Each structure stands twice: as C-alpha cells, then as structure tokens.
Design a protein around this ligand. Sequence first.
Ligand SMILES: O=C(Cc1cccc(Cl)c1)Nn1cnc2ccccc21
Ligand SMILES: O=C(Cc1cccc(Cl)c1)Nn1cnc2ccccc21
Lengths: 304, 304
Amino acid sequence: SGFRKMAFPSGKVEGCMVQVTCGTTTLNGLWLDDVVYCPRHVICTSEDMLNPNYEDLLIRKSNHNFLVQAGNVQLRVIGHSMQNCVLKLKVDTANPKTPKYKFVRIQPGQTFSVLACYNGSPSGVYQCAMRPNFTIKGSFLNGSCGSVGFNIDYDCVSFCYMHHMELPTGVHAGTDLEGNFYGPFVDRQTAQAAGTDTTITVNVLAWLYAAVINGDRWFLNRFTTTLNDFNLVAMKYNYEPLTQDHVDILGPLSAQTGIAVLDMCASLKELLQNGMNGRTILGSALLEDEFTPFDVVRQCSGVT
Amino acid sequence: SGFRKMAFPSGKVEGCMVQVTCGTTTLNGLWLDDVVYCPRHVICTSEDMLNPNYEDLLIRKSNHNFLVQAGNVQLRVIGHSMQNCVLKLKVDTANPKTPKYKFVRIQPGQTFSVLACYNGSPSGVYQCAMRPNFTIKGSFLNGSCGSVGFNIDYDCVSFCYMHHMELPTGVHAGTDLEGNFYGPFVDRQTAQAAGTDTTITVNVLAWLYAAVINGDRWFLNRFTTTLNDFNLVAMKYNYEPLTQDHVDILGPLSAQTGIAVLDMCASLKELLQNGMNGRTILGSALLEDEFTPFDVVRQCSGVT
Ligand SMILES: O=C(Cc1cccc(Cl)c1)Nn1cnc2ccccc21
Ligand SMILES: O=C(Cc1cccc(Cl)c1)Nn1cnc2ccccc21
C-alpha cells in the first residue's frame, strides 16, 4: 500500500542525454541512433529571441557550428535540419545506449516522466501531467531546454515531450519530438498566455479509487448521481466534462473496488461542494488530478 | 521556476537490481561488485515469518539454494552470510554496472530516492523522507522487498535504505545496507507500531523558502518571533523542535531570499495557528516537510 507521484525509472533516457552548443548557447539534446534532437532556439542569442527568423538564422550555421558532447566525448556532426521547432543533428556515430523508442504526441490529461537536465547531465526525475491548456507545471531552470518527457512500456521508451520555454506565469511549454508545440505557444520571447486550465476529472476519480484501495474511505457517501448532474457541478468548478469514455476507462478501478463510477462521482460532487473540512486524502489536502486511471492500476498492481 | 518532489536519476541503481529467490520466495537484491544484498526474510516461508529463528533457518540453506538472476542471466553463488537483517551473497562475477557507491545510514528528516522493484525489475522512482519515527511513507506492494533508497553526489551513489516490510498501519520499514533497521522494527510478522510521527520543521521552513523563491509570497507577514516562542507553537502542533543548527542550515536560503530565519518562523507560526484559509503554497494545501534545505538549494540552483 501507499501512493506516490511515481516517475518511470530514467536510466534508458539518461543514456540518450547530450549537451548541444551553438555559438554561446548551451542546452540539452536527445541522441537516438545517429540523430540528436534539441530545441531550435539553440541557434539564437538573447537579441534573436525577441522575434527570430529561424530559417535565416539556421542558414548562417554549418554542421561544424553545432557542438554535440556525450559525457566527455565529442560527436561529429555530418548533417543538420530543422523540423518544426526542433533541430535534428545527424551525427556519424549511432548511440550505443539507444533504447527501443517511439515518438508520440500525448493527449492533454495524460501523464509522463521528466528527466530534467543541465549541460547534457541529468539532475532529477519527476512525474508530470500535460494540462488541458497544454502547459506542464514542471520544475525547470535556465539550461533545462532539451530536457525530455517520456513513458516506458516494458523496454520501449515513448518520447512525448521536449522542454522549450517557461512562460511569464511560471508554467512550462514545449513540443513533441517532431517539434510541434503542445498548445498555441511559439518559440519566441513574447508574452504568451495559456488558456484557462481545468482539472482532469477522470484523473481525480482514478485517484479517489487509489484512495479507496489504500484504506482512505472517509469521503465515500450514501449518494449517487448521473453524468448530466455531475457535469453541471464539474463546469461550476472548472473540471473537465466527464464522458462515457472516461467512465469506461475507470472500469478496472470500479471493478476492483466494487464502487460504481457514478457513485464515485457523487463522492467527488460532495467533495467539490463541501471541501475537505480540514481532512486529507492520500496525504493531500486537495483533489489530485495528475494520476491517470492507467497510473493508478500500474502503481497498485506492480507493473515493471 | 516550479517546484516538484524530484527524485535522483535512477539509472545507476537500475544497473544493480537483481532477482533473488530462495525456496518459493522471490524478492529484489542489490548487486554491487561481487556481492548481492537482499533482506534475510527471503529464507522464510509464510509460516516462518510468525517468529523466525534466522540463524537456524539460514543453516538449512546452501549457496546453491539462493538463485540470483540479473536480467536474464544466472549468477553463481559462492558464499553466503547474514549481517544483521541482510543476506550477503557472494557471486563469482563482479557487476560490470557497479557505480561508485557508499553505504550510509541517513538521519531522520533526511530525504532519498526510492527505486521500487518487482522480480529484480524497476517499475518506478519517487522521493521519500525518513520520518522522525524511522518509517517511510512509500508506495510498495508484495514483491517490493529489497527495493533500495539512495542519494547521488555527482557520480557516487550513497545507498541508505533497503525495504523490508509494511506495518499494519500501511507505513514502511526497512534497514540501512548493513541490515540494521531504521527504528525499533524487527523483521517478524508481529504487530509493531511506529512512534508518534512529527513534522520535520526545518524541511517545512526550507519549502517556505522555495515558495518565496518561486513567487508564492502570500503567507509572508509583518511579524517575527524567537526560537523559544516558535518552539512552544511547534510542540503544540507536533513539529520537531527547531535548533540553532537548523537555523544555520537554513542560512543559504535566508541569504538568497533576504528573509531572516526567525521571520520565516513567524510566517510558519501564523500558518500553523490560522491554517491556509483555503489557499495553496507551491500547489499544496498543506505544509510540505519532505524537502530538506539541501534539496531546495539543489532544485533551485540546478545541481546535476
Ligand atoms: O524560456 C527559456 C528561454 C526562451 C525564451 C523564449 C522562448 C523560448 Cl523557446 C525560450 N528557457 N527556459 C525554459 N525553462 C526555463 C526556466 C527558467 C528560465 C529559463 C527557462
Ligand atoms: O511486509 C512484507 C512481508 C513481511 C512480513 C513480516 C516481516 C517482514 Cl520483514 C516482511 N513485505 N512487504 C513489504 N512491503 C509490502 C507492501 C505490501 C505487502 C507486502 C509488503
């Protein structure tokens, strides 16, 4: 028993982290096979970030201008190309530590592990959720650009995120591994705001199931509700509308606990309307939305 | 900016995880050099755990009874010995993936990363604190025994914890890497209770400094206090007494923010007496005590 914000073991990703330098800018790159992926803003200076013309900026750059360092050895760059907001540097050596990998674009509300890096070196790993407004509430500093987000399925690493920027609000924005930003963000030092962020309802429900599984049952009540009545309350509290697909995905947790999804919705409804009354659930005084139903099942069943 | 419960990158520890089987029991082992460390309760059956005589039980065991598997290859056991509550299995092959390592006994209130494992395979990594009552509030299931806790200093892994058992209260107990339990716990299926757990005051203060550093300043007030007045409040709220050493250790954070330690204590005093009034700090509705002043400095400075 016990329930933690658990990240995937990061070893397979650490073996791919490299340092990429261009001019005076240093950030992190992801070395998979003979290709190094990093944010294209590596070619900019502090002046260029105001309104960069990346095609024009990249044109003033040659393979020899990009310095890729893996640990303490230099990689030879034989090709360079821009794909959306990422630079793909072709190196003459394939990464001997390349794990089985896929590039995937996650959906808002899905979770992933982040290996925060500085100078191609990993410093920490944490679990994140892609917010409905496509931002991530991560922990990043200057130099963290190129740090990646991922999921692991037995031996396969699914890369889903590359860190690019911190918005003035403190939240983080980035791209998938093809360089397409999650959300409306652009890689430019201009004031950009994320939309209204909502709470991932299906994830809060999954976490309420984890709480029941772990002995915390105080919030369970003698009431029930309908999808329509529940969603009226969800809209008032800026919670994502619950669909029948969300109910379907909660099926394994509903079967494990013997608590119907709509009965759990009625508990959530009363938690929303009445608050926690100074009590906690799984050690938290607020409703946690950063565990998907898959994460709860995985953590509570022991999927290695 | 941003602040997360960040764990160390776990790669160096994954390369040491092995499966150890004895009779019908399977748990995790830690393979460093030519030695495999695992809980000694691997030699017990469900009947033996009631009141085991480990010396007598180990006597009925030979090197060939302990099956050590690293990935998919079998390790040859040439020696076996019990050191307190751990078995040390001497294998004929030194782990090629052995990182630079130390065995350390952490102090209550200190933090560490846990790589939860099942069948010698890692499934997740999370950050924990050794509670003042020597328990850890981890996330463990049956099969997790032998999972280790550690800290990393550049290239050196300091192993501090090995998981042994879950108490009936749901909290977790284990040993250092010499087999000495943290706390009064014994490796026996008998009702054992942990002491009263207090809040790690110095860690809550360090987290209040992280909150100031990250823009969350609502809780800062026009008041101050003394060590004596503050500790009167700390005792009423089951908070560890704050000593001048704790104030000294908070020095870097005090210097970074320009907020004197006793001024931060006065903010904590009012948070304790008045609650959060429905507000949050760093995304939490309660006072977080699982970040030491070192963790806050590391996370907020980017130590890789
Ligand atoms: O935000 C940037 C630089 C940048 C400016 C404008 C656009 C772009 Cl794409 C990049 N880097 N960055 C990422 N996370 C950080 C956290 C703290 C400070 C800087 C951090
Ligand atoms: O508690 C035990 C078995 C055991 C019984 C008595 C004493 C000893 Cl040393 C070990 N294993 N264990 C550890 N974490 C767990 C979590 C959920 C279930 C079982 C888990």
